[PDB]
Symmetry: none
Subunit: 174 residues, 2 copies
């Protein structure tokens, strides 16, 4: 519940979204030693991550993102997504899911320098805008509770609900 701890687990999770699906090996980021706690979180998020991968309306919007000049697209999404001073785990999770495919959309266009670059922005944005609220949720473990074991496909609708809804605004305001 020290920033450190939250930052730490944060990168770990973030990296989870990424390396699970897909590039100079010398600059690679050595996998972060998971333990029990962060095991169930990641075990969970990969379950979300595929229901989301399977949401087309989201996939469409995702497809509409600047595949290789995404500095601005990320920070404007992240801004709007919490533009209301509230926070739920849905929102956090989505931001993470979004960042993930930002990468996969760049790895495909083969610009691996940015793995780091994006992982940078997020965890930055984590610290600047969320470290507080998470700290005040007893840390990440709350996020498990956000996902009880039958209600997968339901929350996921609402969680894509917001992410789509925000990409969409970006899509029109330029």
């Amino acid at each position: 519940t020290s920033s450190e701890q939250i930052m730490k687990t944060g990168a770990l999770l973030l990296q989870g979204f990424i390396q699970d699906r897909a590039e100079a090996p010398e600059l690679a980021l050595d996998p972060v030693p998971q333990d029990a706690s962060t095991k169930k979180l990641s075990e969970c998020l990969k379950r979300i991550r595929d229901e989301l991968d399977s949401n087309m309306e989201l996939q469409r919007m995702i497809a509409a993102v600047d595949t290789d000049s995404p500095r601005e697209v990320f920070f404007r999404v992240a801004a709007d997504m919490f533009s209301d001073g509230n926070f739920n785990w849905g929102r956090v999770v989505a931001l993470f899911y979004f960042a993930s495919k930002l990468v996969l959309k760049a790895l495909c266009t083969k610009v691996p320098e940015l793995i780091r670059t994006i992982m940078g922005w997020t965890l930055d944005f984590l610290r600047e805008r969320l470290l507080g609220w998470i700290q005040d949720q007893g840390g990440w473990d709350g996020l498990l509770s956000y996902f009880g074991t039958p209600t997968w496909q339901t929350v996921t609708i609402f969680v894509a609900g917001v992410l789509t809804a925000s990409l969409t605004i970006w899509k029109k305001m330029g």
Copy 2:
């Protein structure tokens, strides 16, 4: 008219019945971005929802439901309500109205974990038993047609007619 679309609008409407009247903010479900189409549906259902709120014979039966062990009461109602392989919008609407107050009857007994849980069951039941028929009605927009603008208080009688009639059977078969 893809399941997605129908599922989507489905949650949106469902959530409409609920959050319009009334609880850990961290697990909250972020409101689903409405558009024009689903605007009139929800604009409509809230008009039904109050004529129903105002039907006492229904309110009585509603009062007789297990306030906090409702897994079975819901699925047995939903079963009987379409136990005849026919479908009208009245029936659908009522199922939705019922689920709504199931929640409000639980929020009052302060068990907010179940918001999700019930929203789960319904949209499940939506998919398994209704996605077909709605798909074959050109989707939800048909439901508007079920409610022409003078004949409010009439259909509502028949719509409560069925819902009461089904709770009633549950009330006796145990």
